[PDB]
Ligand binder design. Structure first.
Ligand SMILES: Cc1cc2nc3c(=O)[nH]c(=O)nc-3n(C[C@H](O)[C@H](O)[C@H](O)COP(=O)(O)OP(=O)(O)OC[C@H]3O[C@@H](n4cnc5c(N)ncnc54)[C@H](O)[C@@H]3O)c2cc1C
Ligand SMILES: Cc1ncc(CO)c(CN)c1O
Length: 508
């Protein structure tokens, strides 16, 4: 209610609603644009792709991308309690320690380093290796290490990678991320487990100091001096003004910057062009946009029927250096085993069961894009330019990734499954490879960076996640990430939320 308002009930928001309200002297209101879940397919891990295009998916469309053969891309996003966590591939990857070293350099604060994050990840995790001093034990989020249920295709892929020199890992989360392993998953008893499941339990929801408001969109934050004084909330019925002492934005990589721009906080020139009065000129709001790509894909005809995944279809990412299968350290590329024959819209889909794809990507793209509001209204679509493949480094590294994928794909360890390669076949030059890659890449679903945390004067938030231009507004979601982690970012978003919860309880 009165003390703190959380905008957006997604991954970070669900965690915060629970954690902030642990203080009985704190009144917490959670405002979510979507509805509570009712669709049962949501908890079926193997149904995650079918979830897209449904009612609770924002379904943004990017600008045409010159670096991906002029293709425009669809960006699925959760619009319901639990957010993008409902739509997940449910992979759990903390990231690599060096990923977070970059956050430390950017933020000027040690709290964002692997060593300090370690107890934070551990507080979040309920992991089967919990107790080893590295992984968490007894935390709200189950982490599952698949073994028996791993697809024989995925095991064959893992063997192919292992034969090449990649070490065998138990999940990606020990601080060592390069190697071969089934992906760790947020699954318990065969059921997907979301942020909302883990943190917004029946007990938490029963707290008299926690109020959850659904089907309600925050349209503008209203200012008085150097503070946010109230929020304008738009519901199925009409609009209403909500007051608060502290405001935390958890609307995610697209919607957090959009809310700020609608409120007249952002690039003066962007707001002008959107017809929004400028109250605080912050040039970096909406900028620094990053995302991961996967090439869809190194497609193989199967020598025998490919049986449906007993997990989540994309069962094993192999992170590695771009120039060697034996070298250790921070990942540069990734090749993943897709039990489903996944291809972009640029290719015809093979019959089900008849093919599998190896997905290939780069782990730390240097390209940087932007999100801008097109007008003042909730209904005015965002202008999203991820700037995919715009740097020479990103393009060169993706050649390395495709090359790594084909090397793994053609190993004897996969001869039991492989009939022959369907894609890319025979690219005989850099340009031909570049063209196939540009036609094949799709989003890995990890948008972030649009409200970047930094120690420099024009960063959007400081190391405490406070919007630099105001006293009582915080941004606590994927938008603050200075840079992408090597792999999927949900663990990182949750780590961001937990460290902010700890900071709030520490200073109040
Ligand atoms: C299909 C898919 C699969 C994925 N798979 C994985 C995976 O396997 N592993 C992994 O690590 N990551 C994965 N991700 C990414 C991960 O889910 C997100 O990075 C993470 O959930 C980001 O959380 P967040 O709190 O920043 O935003 P979100 O979880 O997206 O939450 C934003 C919430 O705020 C609400 N909201 C937005 N605007 C407003 C407003 N104006 N007023 C009120 N409410 C608002 C939205 O409805 C939403 O509920 C996947 C993403 C997608 C789309
Ligand atoms: C397209 C896609 N494939 C596989 C995975 C497995 O982690 C993810 C999750 N980001 C994904 O988005």
């Amino acid at each position: 209610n009165c003390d703190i308002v959380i905008v957006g009930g997604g991954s970070a928001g669900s965690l915060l609603a629970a954690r902030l309200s642990e203080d009985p002297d704190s009144r917490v209101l959670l405002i979510e644009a979507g509805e509570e879940p009712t669709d049962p397919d949501i908890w079926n891990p193997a149904a995650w792709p079918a979830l897209q295009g449904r009612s609770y998916d924002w379904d943004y469309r990017t600008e045409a991308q010159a670096g991906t053969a002029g293709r425009a891309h669809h960006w699925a996003r959760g619009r319901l309690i639990g957010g993008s966590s409902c739509l997940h591939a449910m992979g759990y990857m903390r990231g690599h320690p060096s990923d977070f070293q970059a956050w430390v350099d950017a933020s000027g604060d040690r709290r964002w380093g692997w060593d300090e994050l370690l107890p934070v990840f551990q507080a979040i995790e309920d992991h089967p290796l919990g107790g080893d001093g590295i992984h968490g034990k007894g935390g709200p989020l189950p982490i599952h290490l698949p073994a028996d249920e791993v697809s024989p295709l995925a095991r064959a892929f893992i063997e192919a990678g292992a034969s090449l020199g990649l070490p065998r890992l138990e999940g990606h989360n020990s601080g060592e991320m390069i190697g071969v392993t089934p992906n760790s998953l947020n699954i318990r008893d065969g059921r997907r487990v979301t942020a909302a499941d883990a943190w917004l339990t029946k007990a938490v929801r029963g707290r008299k100091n926690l109020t959850i408001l659904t089907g309600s969109r925050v349209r503008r934050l209203k200012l008085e001096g150097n503070q946010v004084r109230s929020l304008e909330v738009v519901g199925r019925q009409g609009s209403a003004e909500v007051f608060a002492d502290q405001i935390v934005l958890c609307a995610g990589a697209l919607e957090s910057p959009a809310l700020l721009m609608r409120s007249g906080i952002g690039p003066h020139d962007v707001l002008d062009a959107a017809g929004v009065g400028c109250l605080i000129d912050m040039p970096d709001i909406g900028r620094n946009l990053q995302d991961h790509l996967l090439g869809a894909g190194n497609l193989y005809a199967a020598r025998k029927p490919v049986p449906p995944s007993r997990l989540q279809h994309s069962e094993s990412m192999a992170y590695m250096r771009a120039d060697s299968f034996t070298a250790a350290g921070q990942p540069e590329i990734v090749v993943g085993c897709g039990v489903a024959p996944i291809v972009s819209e640029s290719f015809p889909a093979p019959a089900a069961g008849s093919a599998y794809s190896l997905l290939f990507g780069i782990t730390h793209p240097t390209s940087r894009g932007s999100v801008r509001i097109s007008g003042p209204e909730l209904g005015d679509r965002l202008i999203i330019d991820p700037a995919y493949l715009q740097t020479g480094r990103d393009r060169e590294r993706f050649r390395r990734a495709l090359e790594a994928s084909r090397t793994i794909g053609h190993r004897d360890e996969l001869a039991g499954w492989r009939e022959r390669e369907l894609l890319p076949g025979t690219p005989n030059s850099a340009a031909e490879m570049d063209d196939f890659i540009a036609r094949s890449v799709i989003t890995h679903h990890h948008p972030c960076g649009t409200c970047r945390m930094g120690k420099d004067p024009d960063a959007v938030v400081d190391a405490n996640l406070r919007l630099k231009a105001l006293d009582n507004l915080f941004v606590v979601d994927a938008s603050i990430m200075p840079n992408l982690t090597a792999g999927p970012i949900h663990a990182a978003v949750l780590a961001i939320a937990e460290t902010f919860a700890r900071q709030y309880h520490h200073h109040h």
